[PDB]
Amino acid sequence: MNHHHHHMLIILTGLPGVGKSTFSKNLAKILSKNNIDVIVLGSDLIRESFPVWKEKYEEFIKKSTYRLIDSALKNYWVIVDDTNYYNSMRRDLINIAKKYNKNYAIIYLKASLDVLIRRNIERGEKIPNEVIKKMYEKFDEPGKKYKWDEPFLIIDTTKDIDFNEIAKKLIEKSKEIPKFKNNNISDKIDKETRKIVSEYIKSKKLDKDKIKEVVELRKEFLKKIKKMEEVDADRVLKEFKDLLNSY
Amino acid sequence: HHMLIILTGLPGVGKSTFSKNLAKILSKNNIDVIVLGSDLIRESFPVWKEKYEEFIKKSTYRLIDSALKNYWVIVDDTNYYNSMRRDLINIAKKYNKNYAIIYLKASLDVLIRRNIERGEKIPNEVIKKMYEKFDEPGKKYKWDEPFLIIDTTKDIDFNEIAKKLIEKSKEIPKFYVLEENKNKNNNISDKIDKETRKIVSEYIKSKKLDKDKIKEVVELRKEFLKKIKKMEEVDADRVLKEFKDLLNSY
RNA sequence: GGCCGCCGCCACCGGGGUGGUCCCCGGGCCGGACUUCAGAUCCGGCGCGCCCCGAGUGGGGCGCGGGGUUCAAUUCCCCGCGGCGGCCGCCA
RNA sequence: GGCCGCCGCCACCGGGGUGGUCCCCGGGCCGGACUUCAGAUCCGGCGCGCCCCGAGUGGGGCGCGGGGUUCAAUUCCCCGCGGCGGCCGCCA
Ligand SMILES: Nc1ncnc2c1ncn2[C@@H]1O[C@H](COP(=O)(O)OP(=O)(O)NP(=O)(O)O)[C@@H](O)[C@H]1O
Ligand SMILES: [Mg+2]
Known part of the structure; x- marks a missing residue:
C-alpha cells in the first residue's frame, strides 16, 4: 500500500x-x-x-x-x-x-x-x-x-x-482481509404452469408418454414466454390451460 | 448514601x-x-x-x-x-x-x-x-x-x-440547589406585593417624606400584607384599594 | 490564563421581587410578653466593621468594592472583584 | 458442555424458490453473428458416472447417498455424508 498492513x-x-x-x-x-x-x-x-x-x-x-x-x-x-x-x-x-x-x-x-x-x-x-x-x-x-x-x-x-x-x-x-427477492413475472409463470400441470395430470388418466408430453409442452411454453416483451399472467396462463386441453 | x-x-x-x-x-x-x-x-x-x-x-x-x-x-x-x-x-x-x-x-x-x-x-x-x-x-x-x-x-x-x-x-450536595423556582406565592398574592410596593413609592414621592415617616409607611405595608395572607379568598383590586385608602388616612 | 453568556457583591440559609433606607415566599435560629408559673403561641429580631451613649446588663448611629444618577440605589448606569455554564489554553 | 438451527447432495459458482422431469436473480465461462483489436448487443449452450449407436472435432439412454410418499422428488418426510452457525452455560 502506502504491500499492505493493519x-x-x-x-x-x-x-x-x-x-x-x-x-x-x-x-x-x-x-x-x-x-x-x-x-x-x-x-x-x-x-x-x-x-x-x-x-x-x-x-x-x-x-x-x-x-x-x-x-x-x-x-x-x-x-x-x-x-x-x-x-x-x-x-x-x-x-x-x-x-x-x-x-x-x-x-x-x-x-x-x-x-x-x-x-x-x-x-x-x-x-x-x-x-x-x-x-x-x-x-x-x-x-x-x-x-x-x-x-x-x-x-x-x-x-x-x-x-x-x-x-x-x-x-x-x-x-x-477480515471478511468474517420477491418473485417477478417469469417466476409467476413457472409457479403457475407447474400448478396447471399438476391439475391436468390429476384430471385425465393418461399413459406414460402422455405425462411426459405435457411436461415437455410446459418447457416449450416457458421458453417462448421469456422471449415476448410485455406479458400478462392471466392471458398466458389461459393459453397454456387451453393448449393442454387440446391433447 | x-x-x-x-x-x-x-x-x-x-x-x-x-x-x-x-x-x-x-x-x-x-x-x-x-x-x-x-x-x-x-x-x-x-x-x-x-x-x-x-x-x-x-x-x-x-x-x-x-x-x-x-x-x-x-x-x-x-x-x-x-x-x-x-x-x-x-x-x-x-x-x-x-x-x-x-x-x-x-x-x-x-x-x-x-x-x-x-x-x-x-x-x-x-x-x-x-x-x-x-x-x-x-x-x-x-x-x-x-x-x-x-x-x-x-x-x-x-x-x-x-x-x-x-x-x-x-x-446534601449543593451543586443543583441553584434552581428552585418553587414556593412562589399564588399569582394573586404576588400581584398585591408588587402593587402595594409601587403604591408606597408613589405615596412617598407625593408627600416628600423623610427617612423616619418613610419607615413607618414601609412597616404599615408589611403589617397589611401579613393580614391579607390570612384571608382565604381575595381579589387584588379590592385589597389594593383598601391599601391605598389606609395609606391616605395615615 | 483567555473569550462569550448569565448571575452575586442586602448582611442566618435557599428562591423570588423591587427606585423606599428594603420587601415577599419557603426553611432555621435568637430575645421580650405571655396571673407570685413553667409552656405552646402572640410582639420584636437576625451578619461584620467602625463610632457614640450607658456603671453594666444594654441601647443607638454610620457603613457594606469604587464612582455616577437621584430626595433615596439591593434594584438603574460605568468600572472592580467573585460564582456558574460554554468553548479554548494548560495537562511528570 | 447443554439444547437447537441453517445450507448442499440438479449437475459452472453464489443466493432464493418449487411435487413437473426444474425455475428465477446476480456473476463467470465456451461456441456463433463479428469481420485489426477490443467493446457493445444478440443468439446457442455449460457438471459427473456407466452404457448403446456413429466413429468428424457427432447423437442417444439409465443414474446423480440410502429409504419412503409418487405418474413424477431438486423440492416433502426418515436416515447418511458434507459445510457452517445460533442461544444459553458468566470471578469459578
Ligand atoms: N511462561 C511461564 N512459565 C512458567 N510460569 C509462569 C509463566 N508465566 C507466568 N508464570 C507464573 O505462573 C503464575 C501465574 O502467572 P500469570 O501469567 O499471572 O497467569 P494468569 O493466567 O495471568 N493468572 P490469572 O490472572 O489469575 O488467570 C505466576 O507464578 C507466574 O509468574
Ligand atoms: Mg492474569
Whole structure:
C-alpha cells in the first residue's frame, strides 16, 4: 500500500495460573518494538479495583471491561488478558472485532493441571485448588465447536515461548482481509404452469408418454414466454390451460 | 448514601496505598467502593507515548463516571492541577453526589528517597520541579479546599477518616440547589406585593417624606400584607384599594 | 490564563421581587410578653466593621468594592472583584 | 458442555424458490453473428458416472447417498455424508 498492513484484536484464553498476564506483557513489549501501539485489557483491571469481591460487581466489571476494549480497538491493537473459558465469551469479544472490521486471533495458553495446581499454590491459593480443578474440566477447548473459534496458536506455557516468532505471525495476519427477492413475472409463470400441470395430470388418466408430453409442452411454453416483451399472467396462463386441453 | 473521593498528592506520597487501606475500611462499613485512577489504563500500554494521554484521560473519566452511579469512587491520582480536580468534581455534580478532596503530603526529602527506592523511573529532577511548582489545593478556589490534609509520614487513623467520610456522605450536595423556582406565592398574592410596593413609592414621592415617616409607611405595608395572607379568598383590586385608602388616612 | 453568556457583591440559609433606607415566599435560629408559673403561641429580631451613649446588663448611629444618577440605589448606569455554564489554553 | 438451527447432495459458482422431469436473480465461462483489436448487443449452450449407436472435432439412454410418499422428488418426510452457525452455560 502506502504491500499492505493493519491492526487487530488478540484474544487470550486459558485457565488461572497458565500465564496469561505474563504472556500479555511480553507479547505487548515485542509488538511495541515493532512500532505497533498495543494495549492490554482484561476484566481483572476493574475487578481488583474493588477492595473485596462480591457477585454483584461482576455485571459492572464485565460491561466496563467491554467498553474499554471496544473504545480501545478503535485506535490500538488489543490483547484481551482473560480466561475466557466459555466459547460464548470468545464470540462476544470477536463481535467487537467484527464491529470494527478488524482481524482477530485467539491464542490458547495450555498447561497440565498438575502445573496449574502447583502454580495456584505458589501464589497463595486465593482461588481454591478444587476450583482450578473443576474449571480445568469445564473448559471449552477452543475450536471444538465453531470454526470462528479455532485458535490461531496453541501455546504450551511449560516450554519456552518465541515472542519474536509470535509477533511476526500476528503482524502477518493483521495484513489479511477480515471478511468474517420477491418473485417477478417469469417466476409467476413457472409457479403457475407447474400448478396447471399438476391439475391436468390429476384430471385425465393418461399413459406414460402422455405425462411426459405435457411436461415437455410446459418447457416449450416457458421458453417462448421469456422471449415476448410485455406479458400478462392471466392471458398466458389461459393459453397454456387451453393448449393442454387440446391433447 | 454515596460520594466521590478525590485524592491529590505528589508521586510517591502514598496515594495507592492510602486508597486501598481506606477502601478496605469502607467495605467493613458495608460500603461498596471502587478505586480508579489514570494509571490503570496508562500502565496497560507496554510503553508510554504522549499521544496516549487523551485516550487514558477519556477512558478513566468514563470509568469513574459509570462507577459513581453505584459505588463510592476513590480517585487514586496525583491530580496535580486544580483544573483536574474540578473535572472530577463535575462528574460528582453531574449525579449530584457529594465529594471530598483528600490531600496527601510528605516532605520533598521523603519523596526523593521514595522515588529512588522505586527505581527512579521518574527523574529525581522531575520530582523536584513537580514538588517545587505544585500549588496546594484550596489556595485559589473554595471548592478546591481539601476535606482533609494527611501527612503520610505520621500515623493514619483509617477508622477515623472513614467515620468522617461516611458522616459527610449523608449531607446534601449543593451543586443543583441553584434552581428552585418553587414556593412562589399564588399569582394573586404576588400581584398585591408588587402593587402595594409601587403604591408606597408613589405615596412617598407625593408627600416628600423623610427617612423616619418613610419607615413607618414601609412597616404599615408589611403589617397589611401579613393580614391579607390570612384571608382565604381575595381579589387584588379590592385589597389594593383598601391599601391605598389606609395609606391616605395615615 | 483567555473569550462569550448569565448571575452575586442586602448582611442566618435557599428562591423570588423591587427606585423606599428594603420587601415577599419557603426553611432555621435568637430575645421580650405571655396571673407570685413553667409552656405552646402572640410582639420584636437576625451578619461584620467602625463610632457614640450607658456603671453594666444594654441601647443607638454610620457603613457594606469604587464612582455616577437621584430626595433615596439591593434594584438603574460605568468600572472592580467573585460564582456558574460554554468553548479554548494548560495537562511528570 | 447443554439444547437447537441453517445450507448442499440438479449437475459452472453464489443466493432464493418449487411435487413437473426444474425455475428465477446476480456473476463467470465456451461456441456463433463479428469481420485489426477490443467493446457493445444478440443468439446457442455449460457438471459427473456407466452404457448403446456413429466413429468428424457427432447423437442417444439409465443414474446423480440410502429409504419412503409418487405418474413424477431438486423440492416433502426418515436416515447418511458434507459445510457452517445460533442461544444459553458468566470471578469459578
Ligand atoms: N511462561 C511461564 N512459565 C512458567 N510460569 C509462569 C509463566 N508465566 C507466568 N508464570 C507464573 O505462573 C503464575 C501465574 O502467572 P500469570 O501469567 O499471572 O497467569 P494468569 O493466567 O495471568 N493468572 P490469572 O490472572 O489469575 O488467570 C505466576 O507464578 C507466574 O509468574
Ligand atoms: Mg492474569
